[PDB]
Design a protein around this ligand. Structure first.
Ligand SMILES: CC(C)=CC(=O)SCCNC(=O)CCNC(=O)[C@H](O)C(C)(C)COP(=O)(O)OP(=O)(O)OC[C@@H]1O[C@H](n2cnc3c(N)ncnc32)[C@@H](O)[C@@H]1OP(=O)(O)O
Ligand SMILES: CC(C)=CC(=O)SCCNC(=O)CCNC(=O)[C@H](O)C(C)(C)COP(=O)(O)OP(=O)(O)OC[C@@H]1O[C@H](n2cnc3c(N)ncnc32)[C@@H](O)[C@@H]1OP(=O)(O)O
Ligand SMILES: CC(C)=CC(=O)SCCNC(=O)CCNC(=O)[C@H](O)C(C)(C)COP(=O)(O)OP(=O)(O)OC[C@@H]1O[C@H](n2cnc3c(N)ncnc32)[C@@H](O)[C@@H]1OP(=O)(O)O
Lengths: 138, 514, 514, 514
């Protein structure tokens, strides 16, 4: 069946958290370990920062607007609906597990991103969401 | 060994106090107004030009910035209020240009992007001033510059203010050349039309990226170093170029783990309020912003009207100098001593200005105060450590010079939404002018009437009141931005981080007039 | 061996020619007008204030300068026309301040004297700009500064333009401190009242001289280093202090005996005239000014529109670059090559601008011209040898940048009484605006009438014509003075002499975009 | 942030193609021949001298190298083919000396070992040249030198080529002294007889190790600093001395994790082949050698004949410049720009030469090509970053100079087994000489016959063909070795690693003739 809005929200959160993790590694290498720039807050002066992200589900493309709240939660609006999502990525055993609350509903999954595809493995099932290629990298 | 405890500043304010309630109300109103105005400026040139810009397929400048910087990195925008009601009938949001500091490929860079929506990206005089300020910041802090050129050339109806003079348009190119000579990367991305007078920017740059849709430039002129299909591709190419820069950050100061302040920052609203007549202890602010609320005061009981000490912000060491009353001889001497000490140990300096007006005291023997403030002025001017100024209250007269105003080239200068800046208080200027005219016309034997006294006084009062507004001062580029107090700490962190890119070099002092 | 002969430039002009007669008439009229206006400015604030100033026993500022400098030494005044009709109803002769370079005790020094007659010596914004320019000149050329302080503080009705910003009043003190740190002598002579905001100047200075009739300052404050009975005594004491400076002039260039040019300078009046539409050979000017009319051209048959070569002025070597037509690719490349060569050999540079307008040619393929002029702009900006610019004709567009305009920090910049400076010619700007509006309103389907075309065109024509006036440009400090052509050689000599005080240091170049 | 993807070069070649098969066959044959010849050279002086050397109890030089370097460390031998058929009847394997770079006690060192088997270790002129080249490499890259002295002095029958001139034997000692002055360690190990003219090497050295079995030297002369029982003990002592050097490697470039190229290296055999007439895309080679096959081209559509860009090899940054066709004006300008850019950012440079002969095009207007290639030559000469050249194809005429030939002091220079080097192609030289003689003898009225034309042409063709052989060029020390293409990447890595020992200092450029 076609994936719901909530699964797309979880996938977007997972991708953002991965970007944060790479930022953490690059910070680990550098001299300026404690610089505020290394934070993934997305803070702007007197404005709230919003990302227009594009995720590919099945044969239909879906656009998600992710607003970076000051508290660290994310306000993702897909179409008419708006969802408040807070999550973190932590390692169970050898495996990256995303724990995420969307609109106050908490869910646990295994997150594997290889190439474009993002794989959420959970008790309900597996959801695959594709990051579109910039198509200038061919 | 780093285990011994240190006393912390700050006290819990009285939330029940009526004074706190009223101050909170006023300051929150000011901040809400600031946020609303910033949103309106963010909207840009207008729906008309925005739709036209989108129809041409080009991205909006803010989207360009969002895609350019690292994912989730904070972006420090500067001078969001340039041109705010500066020109009589023309609305120029953001000055027609967007300048800020952001992290690209793990490197702090200064990003300068023309806004095509506002008057086709033409260059108003304020736009030139904003760009020159950004280039000056990048030169001083040794930051790579990235230009997102979508320009329209000088605004012809105002050419006399844009083209000819030293700090006019040509200085832009001058700066570019100089920053290329000192090995500071210049990257230009021609995301708009390559109109007359615009090709100079790509030609001066070290590296170019040109969006496909002159054609002669990429194929034959060879100005193009890279050639991109559209905006997204150009931004990706820019990130790749920045990576290929071969640069590594060199820091030369001791670092410690960072720790949050012990008190919430929003309490500042209650402490400061919007009335300059009431006063407050700067130690409250210092407790709210510094790491762990830990502060080591220096010469606490001498020159009590000035508060100087050492602290850490996000782990970096800082020397803090702030006003707590009317400046005096002892305060000036303490400040000079502290500045010398900080320069010797290579520690960044942070000034907080809350200059108090002279309406309270008629004379204050300006001669001695001047004789001592001159020493402090010289010491501040000759200093070479990074200096950041923050105006949390009034700023009047030579005290502004003494506390490192714009003339003394602080690396950054911010003001709170409740500041006031002018040469004197309005009523004092009115009295001075009235006395001058009265004495003169008495000298020539002419009679001075009280109606004439009011006639001189009132326009001066209104004019000084109007010119002291923070929005008036930030419309011109007299400060790098108006910041919500609740965010102050964060901003300072970013600023200081950027200031650490340049190496700190030794300070040379003039003759200390003893 | 220095005996072999050299060919000399210059040809005898046709005195009988009607064109020569007419050009001579027009240029002589312009020079007479200039001289009359200068005399009127020299008269000062007015007979009222002059009588009042004399009654107080103080000397007039020009008399102060006359007594201060060495007997019979030439004095190079700068910016005599600042504030000329700048403010709507207020007449501010000389900007209210007198700045120049003169020889005191055998040392070139920069003298800055407040004029008490003009508005009690208050500081108009133009006055601050003039003083900052003088301080910049002294810093760059390493010249001792002498202040003759008779001040009145900032002009309050205009405080917003005088106090707050970076290039506003405080920068003055900043400069003082810096120039003291780099061991450049600062001498202050308090010849007037030590009013509020004035004591900072003596306090910042290295040495002070105070005329007796604060009293507390000499006896108790100790700001006074010397104490003089009256103006004459103070000036003598200043000369003694300057002698005690322990300074010796270090020159690092080869010197040859000087020789006068072979042709009379007044002939320039006939050659140049007042009409910019007619053109002339810059080689005539070069022959009139350089020593012995001897000139060694470089790449004479390539890029003929630019004339570059070597000569000597009063025995010093100079590289001369001038326009002889529309600048092109080859001209730009020749200029870049010559600039590199002169920088390598440490030779001062002299630019002569006679930029030709584009009314003659519709397109001139601005892209290629830009691609090449960018190289010349970069080369000029990065240069470190002393640079002196002289505008003998039109100066328009990016060519002004290419020929070392104000933005590129020439040590001096002078203009002849017949110059014109603007971003473009007026008619060209009118056509550009008309085309923009026509194309736009066609895009939205609106009709554009010819009456509207004239309505847009005429104000632009008049405004550009007015703003291009030499007096308009010199009222603001966009140039260091308007000079009679017949004296040009002399002025250059003095200027170059001063520029030789500072040591010449190596030039670093950016990436030469090949 | 380092997460965004980058496009990779390289395409899978057509293994089924007949052209690929034939090219693979030819190149594999060349490599097999090279390997066989190297094995024969490795065998050394001969079984006679080897048995004699063993009977004396001394180790063979290759065994000395094996025991000296760190266990399992790769050893970079240089100029294995010196003296290959250089002298008419005398076989001089390896030039009689073994020079290489290897890691001893964790430090890169240059090891120079005399081969006693070859003519008793006498010094042929080629041996002196090889040793001087090794010393030059060590001086430039700041590497400690270890000498394994088993010498026999100059080869007397050729003294005129070994003793007297500047680059003759004495320069060896000169280099030693200089490298001692600049604090570059000199270690000498006298593993053979201390014959006449040999004691100078230990005496010049910083530290000595002498094998027991002059006796006077250790006990009384005191030249001996250490005294070893036999070869094994001497090598151990050398390792201990190297440890005691107190040296730490200082790198000043950004480092990234290394990644293997995406395509197998042996495919190069098919791509390149042995026929110079056919051409190939240098991008294939670049894809095969650089890390991850990631390459960022610079000015791709301008001067397409040259290919310039940035990449990483084993994590180090490199700027790659290669030929893809006949060099032109645009190619030269692109190369100059790229060289300036790389010098500014302090990035090592790697040149790939595949100069194409002019047999295809009669004229190619040598004047303009020269006028532009001069700029590239100047830029390459003045550069200061490490430069490594690799000749993958033809190398002819001034193009060789433009692509950093031996005259321009690259840190290393290698050639593939299929290269050709000469001033011109043979047939072109034949035509030039024929035309010269024809024109001259026509000038004197003499008749030129076709038989004479063939008589001039054929010897020139054969001579140029013979002199262009890689073995001919490597017999003399014109290159640091012939390398199997399949190993190219590895070699470059080692080379660049060594080149990083020296600090990179700023580049000074001459006048860029615009
Ligand atoms: C370096 C040196 C040494 C010298 C120089 O550089 S001398 C440079 C001369 N400039 C040009 O030669 C560019 C002329 N523009 C154009 O060719 C185009 O316009 C573009 C390219 C700007 C794209 O703009 P566009 O065509 O996509 O849209 P448009 O709506 O037309 O854009 C807004 C409209 O621009 C009008 N407008 C008014 N003043 C100017 C101005 N000074 N520059 C540009 N536009 C201006 C504005 O009044 C109207 O809007 P408004 O006020 O009616 O609402
Ligand atoms: C550094 C920082 C950080 C801050 C500061 O510095 S804040 C400094 C505040 N200034 C003073 O506190 C000096 C107040 N002057 C005086 O005390 C005197 O005046 C003297 C000392 C100037 C001597 O002058 P005087 O008394 O000998 O003659 P007078 O004719 O009176 O001189 C001309 C008359 O000055 C009037 N006038 C108008 N505007 C000003 C002005 N801004 N300053 C001075 N005078 C002004 C003018 O309008 C009238 O002439 P007019 O226009 O009627 O023809
Ligand atoms: C710096 C300045 C300013 C000046 C000087 O340095 S002036 C140096 C003068 N040299 C000596 O004073 C060393 C004289 N050698 C000897 O004392 C020994 O020989 C040893 C030490 C070389 C060990 O060699 P070894 O004794 O173990 O074996 P051997 O077979 O004998 O070694 C091969 C045989 O060397 C013969 N041979 C021919 N020419 C030479 C030559 N020029 N040098 C050495 N040997 C040579 C070769 O013809 C024969 O072999 P071949 O040709 O018959 O097959």
């Amino acid at each position: 069946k076609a994936a719901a809005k909530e699964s797309l929200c979880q996938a977007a959160l997972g991708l953002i958290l991965k970007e944060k993790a790479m930022t953490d590694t690059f910070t680990l290498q550098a001299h300026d370990q404690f610089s505020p720039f290394s934070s993934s807050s997305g803070r702007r002066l007197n404005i709230s920062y919003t990302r227009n992200m594009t995720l590919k589900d099945g044969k239909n493309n879906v656009a998600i607007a992710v607003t970076y709240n000051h508290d660290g939660s994310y306000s993702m609006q897909i179409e008419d609906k708006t969802f408040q999502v807070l999550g973190n990525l932590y390692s169970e055993g050898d495996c990256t597990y995303l724990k995420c609350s969307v609109n106050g509903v908490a869910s646990k999954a295994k997150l594997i991103i290889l190439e474009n595809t993002i794989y959420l493995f959970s008790k309900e099932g597996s959801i695959e969401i594709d990051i579109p290629v910039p198509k200038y990298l061919s | 060994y780093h285990g011994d405890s240190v006393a912390s500043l700050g006290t819990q304010p009285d939330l029940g106090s009526a004074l706190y309630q009223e101050n909170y109300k006023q300051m929150k109103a000011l901040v809400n107004q600031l946020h609303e105005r910033v949103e309106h400026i963010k909207l840009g040139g207008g729906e008309k030009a925005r739709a036209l810009h989108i129809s041409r397929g080009k991205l909006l400048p803010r989207e360009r910035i969002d895609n350019l910087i690292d994912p989730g990195s904070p972006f420090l925008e500067l001078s969001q209020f340039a041109g705010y009601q500066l020109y009589d009938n023309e609305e120029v949001p953001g000055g027609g240009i967007i300048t800020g500091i952001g992290r690209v490929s793990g490197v702090e860079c200064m990003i300068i992007a023309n806004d095509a929506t506002v008057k086709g990206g033409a260059y108003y005089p304020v736009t030139v001033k904003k760009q020159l300020r950004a280039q000056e910041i990048a030169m001083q802090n040794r930051l790579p510059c990235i230009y997102l050129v979508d320009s329209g050339g000088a605004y012809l109806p105002r050419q006399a203010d844009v083209f000819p003079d030293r700090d006019h348009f040509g200085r832009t190119f001058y700066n570019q050349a100089i920053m290329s000579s000192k090995n500071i990367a210049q990257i230009a991305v021609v995301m708009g039309s390559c109109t007359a007078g615009g090709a100079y920017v790509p030609a001066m740059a070290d590296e170019n990226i040109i969006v496909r849709k002159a054609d002669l430039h990429c194929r034959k002129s060879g100005v193009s170093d890279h050639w991109a299909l559209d905006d997204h591709h150009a931004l990706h190419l820019t990130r790749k170029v920045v990576r290929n820069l071969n640069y590594q950050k060199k820091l030369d100061v001791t670092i410690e783990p960072s720790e949050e302040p012990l008190f919430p920052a929003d309490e500042l609203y209650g402490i400061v309020g919007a009335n300059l007549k009431r006063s407050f202890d700067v130690r409250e602010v210092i407790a709210r912003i510094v790491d762990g609320s830990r502060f080591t005061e220096f010469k606490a009981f001498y020159g009590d009207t000035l508060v100087t000490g050492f602290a850490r912000i996000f782990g970096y060491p800082v020397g803090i100098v702030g006003n707590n009353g009317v400046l005096f001889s002892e305060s000036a001497k303490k400040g000079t001593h502290f500045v010398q000490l900080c320069c010797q140990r290579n520690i960044p300096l942070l000034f907080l200005q809350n200059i108090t007006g002279f309406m309270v005291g008629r004379e204050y023997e300006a001669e001695g105060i001047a004789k001592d403030g001159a020493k402090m002025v010289a010491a501040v001017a000759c200093a070479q450590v990074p200096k950041i100024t923050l105006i949390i209250g009034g700023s009047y007269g030579a005290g502004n010079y003494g506390m490192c105003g714009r003339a003394y080239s602080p690396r950054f200068l911010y003001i709170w939404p409740n500041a006031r800046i002018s040469v004197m208080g309005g009523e004092q200027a009115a009295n001075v002018l009235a006395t001058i005219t009265k004495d003169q016309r008495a000298r020539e034997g002419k009679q001075f009437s009280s109606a004439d006294e009011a006639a001189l006084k009132e326009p001066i009062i209104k004019k000084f009141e109007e010119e002291g507004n923070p929005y008036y001062s930030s419309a011109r580029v007299w400060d790098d931005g108006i910041i919500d107090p609740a965010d102050t700490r964060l901003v300072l962190g970013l600023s200081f981080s950027a200031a650490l890119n340049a190496p700190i070099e030794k300070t040379d002092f003039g003759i200390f007039r003893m």
